[PDB]
Amino acid sequence: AAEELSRCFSPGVIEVQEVQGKKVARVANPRLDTFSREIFRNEKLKKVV
Amino acid sequence: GGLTCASAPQGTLRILEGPQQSLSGSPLQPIPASPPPQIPPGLRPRFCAFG
């Protein structure tokens, strides 16, 4: 789901880096986000942002 | 030279050119379907948010 979340925002916002075997996701430069709301199209991940 | 008359003809054979065989092929040849539009390859966000 982190690689799915990284493509719902503009390129640069959610980086997906490994922390002990799993690929967690964190915010990084929220300034870049074009505010296109593409994550609210995704049903599993409109409850995690 | 008298040219007398004769009896009634029984049947009348009609000679005519034959039907055009081997003109149409046994499968049909349709115009192929115009393709559905593709998302073109190499599409990326070219607009960065300012500042």
From Swiss-Prot, chain A:
It is found in: Nucleus; Nucleus, Nucleolus; Cytoplasm, Cytosol. It comes from the Eukaryota. Belongs to the archaeal Rpo3/eukaryotic RPB3 RNA polymerase subunit family. DNA-dependent RNA polymerase catalyzes the transcription of DNA into RNA using the four ribonucleoside triphosphates as substrates. Common component of RNA polymerases I and III which synthesize ribosomal RNA precursors and short non-coding RNAs including 5S rRNA, snRNAs, tRNAs and miRNAs, respectively. POLR1C/RPAC1 is part of the polymerase core and may function as a clamp element that moves to open and close the cleft. It is linked to Treacher Collins syndrome 3: A form of Treacher Collins syndrome, a disorder of craniofacial development. Treacher Collins syndrome is characterized by a combination of bilateral downward slanting of the palpebral fissures, colobomas of the lower eyelids with a paucity of eyelashes medial to the defect, hypoplasia of the facial bones, cleft palate, malformation of the external ears, atresia of the external auditory canals, and bilateral conductive hearing loss. Leukodystrophy, hypomyelinating, 11: An autosomal recessive neurologic disorder characterized by brain hypomyelination, delayed psychomotor development, intellectual disability, tremor and other neurologic symptoms. Some patients may additionally manifest non-neurologic features, particularly dental abnormalities and hypogonadotropic hypogonadism. Component of the RNA polymerase I and RNA polymerase III complexes consisting of at least 13 and 17 subunits, respectively. Pol I complex consists of a ten-subunit catalytic core composed of POLR1A/RPA1, POLR1B/RPA2, POLR1C/RPAC1, POLR1D/RPAC2, POLR1H/RPA12, POLR2E/RPABC1, POLR2F/RPABC2, POLR2H/RPABC3, POLR2K/RPABC4 and POLR2L/RPABC5; a mobile stalk subunit POLR1F/RPA43 protruding from the core and additional subunits homologous to general transcription factors POLR1E/RPA49 and POLR1G/RPA34. This is DNA-directed RNA polymerases I and III subunit RPAC1. It comes from Homo sapiens (Human). The lineage of its organism: Eukaryota, Metazoa, Chordata, Craniata, Vertebrata. The gene is POLR1C. The chain holds residues 249 to 297 of 346 of the full protein.
From Swiss-Prot, chain B:
It is found in: Nucleus, Nucleolus; Chromosome. Residues 18-41 are annotated as: Disordered. It comes from the Eukaryota. The modification Phosphoserine is found at S26, S34. Residues 29-41 have a biased composition (Pro residues). Transmembrane segments: none annotated. It is in an antisense orientation to and overlaps the gene of the DNA repair enzyme ERCC1. This gene overlap is conserved in mouse, suggesting an important biological function. Component of RNA polymerase I (Pol I), a DNA-dependent RNA polymerase which synthesizes ribosomal RNA precursors using the four ribonucleoside triphosphates as substrates. Involved in UBTF-activated transcription, presumably at a step following PIC formation. Belongs to the eukaryotic RPA34 RNA polymerase subunit family. Component of the RNA polymerase I (Pol I) complex consisting of 13 subunits: a ten-subunit catalytic core composed of POLR1A/RPA1, POLR1B/RPA2, POLR1C/RPAC1, POLR1D/RPAC2, POLR1H/RPA12, POLR2E/RPABC1, POLR2F/RPABC2, POLR2H/RPABC3, POLR2K/RPABC4 and POLR2L/RPABC5; a mobile stalk subunit POLR1F/RPA43 protruding from the core and additional subunits homologous to general transcription factors POLR1E/RPA49 and POLR1G/RPA34. Forms a heterodimer with POLR1E/RPA49. Part of Pol I pre-initiation complex (PIC), in which Pol I core assembles with RRN3 and promoter-bound UTBF and SL1/TIF-IB complex. This is DNA-directed RNA polymerase I subunit RPA34. The chain holds residues 103 to 153 of 510 of the full protein.
